[PDB]
Amino acid sequence: MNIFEMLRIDEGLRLKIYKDTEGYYTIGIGHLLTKSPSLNAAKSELDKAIGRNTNGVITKDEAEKLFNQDVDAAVRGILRNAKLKPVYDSLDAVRRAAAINMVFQMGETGVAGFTNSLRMLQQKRWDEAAVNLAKSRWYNQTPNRAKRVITTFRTGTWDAYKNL
Ligand SMILES: [Cl-]
């Protein structure tokens, strides 16, 4: 298991434009295109992302290319953020994956707002951090995925992803 396999499990893979859990146009492995309700606007973003005039449809190779870029962007966002970087630096590689997962799903700004959870993670108060993380719109809206990510933070193991 690793961050790529982890996010592949959590996001799935779809080669045609679809709507994510919030109703936003998305493609591939959870690549958000736009928050606009316009499918045309989504298609425009897709073509710009891929570098060709698509039919709202991409190849697996293209989906994986975007995915790698998005994983990179998440790590980049963490390392450039004053609130996220020290917590990330403080973590083991398994828990680092959980942090990347959250940033991939909700963005750097959203994750940086988990101030109290972040503090508990940096203190390595795993059970307390887990309890705090679950007190969120995030957990309520995507509880099964959030449970997996929280279990990863709680245990520093891949146990939540091993049956998957
Ligand atoms: Cl599930």
UniProtKB/Swiss-Prot annotation:
Q: GO molecular function terms here? A: lysozyme activity
Reported effect, S117I: 500-fold decrease in enzymatic activity
Outcome after substituting G30A: Almost complete loss of enzymatic activity
Q: What's one GO-annotated cellular component?
A: host cell cytoplasm
How does acidity or alkalinity (pH) affect activity? Optimum pH is 7.3.
Effect caused by changing S117F: 10-fold decrease in enzymatic activity
Effect noted on mutating G30F: Almost complete loss of enzymatic activity. The enzyme is destabilized by 1.5 kcal/mol
The effect of S117V is:
50-fold decrease in enzymatic activity
Q: What is its main location?
A: host cell
The active site consists of E11 (proton donor/acceptor), D20 (proton donor/acceptor)
So what does mutating E11 to A/F/H/M/N actually do? Complete loss of enzymatic activity
Compartment(s)? Host cytoplasm
Superkingdom assignment: Viruses
- Tell me what happens on changing E11Q: Complete loss of activity
Keywords (alphabetical) are:
Antimicrobial, Bacteriolytic enzyme, Cytolysis, Glycosidase, Host cell lysis by virus, Host cytoplasm, Hydrolase, Viral release from host cell
Q: Does the keyword Hydrolase apply?
A: yes
Q: Which residues bind substrate?
A: L32, F104, S117, N132
A GO biological process of this protein is: peptidoglycan catabolic process
Q: What is this protein's function per UniProt?
A: Endolysin with lysozyme activity that degrades host peptidoglycans and participates with the holin and spanin proteins in the sequential events which lead to the programmed host cell lysis releasing the mature viral particles. Once the holin has permeabilized the host cell membrane, the endolysin can reach the periplasm and break down the peptidoglycan layer.
The UniProt similarity line reads:
Belongs to the glycosyl hydrolase 24 family.
Instruction: State the name under which the record lists this protein.
Output: Endolysin
Species whose genome carries this gene: Enterobacteria phage T4 (Bacteriophage T4)
Supply the source organism's classification: Viruses, Duplodnaviria, Heunggongvirae, Uroviricota, Caudoviricetes
Gene, per the UniProt record: E
